[PDB]
Structure 1
Amino acid sequence: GDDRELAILATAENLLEDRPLADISVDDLAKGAGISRPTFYFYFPSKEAVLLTLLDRVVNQADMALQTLAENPADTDRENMWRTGINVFFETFGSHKAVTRAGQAARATSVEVAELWSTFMQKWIAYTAAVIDAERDRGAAPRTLPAHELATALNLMNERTLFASFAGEQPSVPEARVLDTLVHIWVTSIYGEN
C-alpha cells in the first residue's frame, strides 16, 4: 500500500539521476517499483505528480532543518550564524541534485510546482528579514536597505547560484567554493555600512 508509493518515489529519484522527466515513462516507474502501470495510476495521476511529491519532500526537509536552527541559539559570531543557515540549503538540495534540477525546470510548466516554490521562498525570505531586523534592533547591523528587499535579493542569489553550481552550469561558482562565496556577500551586505 505505502511502500508501493515510496518505491515509485525512489525509482523516480533514481531515474532522475540519468535523464530528465521527459525521458522517463510511467512504465519506467511502475517497472522500477515492482508494479503494473494501472497500479501506478492508483498512487499518482502522472509522472509530474511524482515529481511534485519528491520536491515537496525536499523543500519541507530543508524547511524543517532551518526551523531546528531557528529554535536553537548556537553561541557563535554573526558570520557563523549565516553560514550554518545557508549550509542547510547547500546540504539538503545538494543531497538531492536531480530532484532539484527537475523541480526547478518544472516551475515553467507546472503551476503547482511554481506555487510550491513560491510559498517556501516567501517563508524563507520573511525569516531572513526577521533576523536582519533583530540584528538591527540590537545594534549589530546598520539601517541600510529595507530588510525585506535585501533579504529577497540575497535569497534569489542563493537560489540561482547554488543551483547553477549543482548542475555545473557554465558560468558557475565551483561547488567547493559556493558556501564561502555566498556567506561573504551575505555578511558584507547585511553588516556593511559601505
Structure 2
Amino acid sequence: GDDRELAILATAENLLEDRPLADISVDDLAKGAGISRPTFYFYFPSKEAVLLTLLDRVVNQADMALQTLAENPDRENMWRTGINVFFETFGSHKAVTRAGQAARATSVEVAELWSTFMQKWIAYTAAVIDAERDRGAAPRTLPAHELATALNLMNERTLFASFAGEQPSVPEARVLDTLVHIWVTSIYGE
C-alpha cells in the first residue's frame, strides 16, 4: 500500500532528472513503479499531483531542518548555517525543485504551497533580524519584514538559477558565499 505510492514517487523523481513533467506520462510512472495505470489513479489523480507531493516533501524537509536549527544554540556563521539548510535540501532534490518552480505558473496548489512556506520563512527571518536589533547587534534600518522578503526572494531566484545551470547564474560552488555576504552586509550594515 504505502510502498506502491512511494514507488510512484521514487519513479517520478528519477524520471524528472532526465526530462520535464510534460515529457513524462502516467504510463511511464506506472511502469517504473511496477503497477498498472488504473492502479496509479488509485493513489494519485494525475502526474501533477505526484509532483505536488514530491515538492511538499522537499519543502517540509527544509522547514523541519530549519526548525531543528532554531531549537538549538558568530553572526556570519549563524546565517551561513541557516542559508545552507536550503542550499543542501533543494540541491539534493534539484529535479523536483526545478519542476516545482515551473509548476507554479500552472498549478494553484503548487503556487499556494510555495507561497505558504515562503511566508513562514520570511516571517522567521524577520523575527531573527528583529531579535538582532533588540539586542543591539543590528542597526534599525529597513523594516525587517521588507528586508527579509527581498533577501528570501533573492535566495529563491539565485539558488534555483544556480541549480538549473541558467545563464546567467552564480556557480553552484560560489552561491553559498555570495548569498551569505549579501545577507550579513544588509542586515548588519549601516
**Residue 108 of structure 1 aligns to a residue in which SS?**
coil
The superposition leaves residues 100-141 of structure 1 with CA deviations (integer Å, 9 ceiling, x where unpaired) of 000000000000000000000000000000000000000000
Shift of 1:44: 0.2
Shift of 1:177: 0.1
2:128 is aligned to 131
CA distance in 2 between counterparts of 1:2 and 1:95 reads 23
Shift of 1:70: 0.5
Shift of 1:186: 0.2
**Residue 48 of structure 1 aligns to a residue in which SS?**
helix
CA distance in 1 between counterparts of 2:2 and 2:175 reads 38
**Residue 19 of structure 1 aligns to a residue in which SS?**
coil
Shift of 1:57: 0.1
* Structure 1 unmatched ranges of 5 or more: none
1:166 is aligned to 163
Shift of 1:65: 0.1
Shift of 1:9: 0.1
CA distance in 2 between counterparts of 1:54 and 1:70 reads 25
Taking structure 2 as the reference length, what is the TM-score of the superposition?
Answer: 1.00
Shift of 1:164: 0.1
**Residue 140 of structure 2 aligns to a residue in which SS?**
coil
Shift of 1:99: 0.1
1:171-190 alignment, distance < 5 Å: 171-190=168-187
The superposition leaves residues 132-157 of structure 1 with CA deviations (integer Å, 9 ceiling, x where unpaired) of 00000000000000000000000000
CA distance in 2 between counterparts of 1:17 and 1:110 reads 20
1:52 is aligned to 52
Count of residue pairs the alignment pairs up: 190
CA distance in 2 between counterparts of 1:18 and 1:71 reads 38
Shift of 1:93: 0.1
Shift of 1:95: 0.1
Q: Is the aligned partner of 1:114 residue 2:108?
A: no
1:37 is aligned to 37
CA distance in 1 between counterparts of 2:89 and 2:70 reads 16
* Structure 2 unmatched ranges of 5 or more: none
Taking structure 1 as the reference length, what is the TM-score of the superposition?
Answer: 0.98
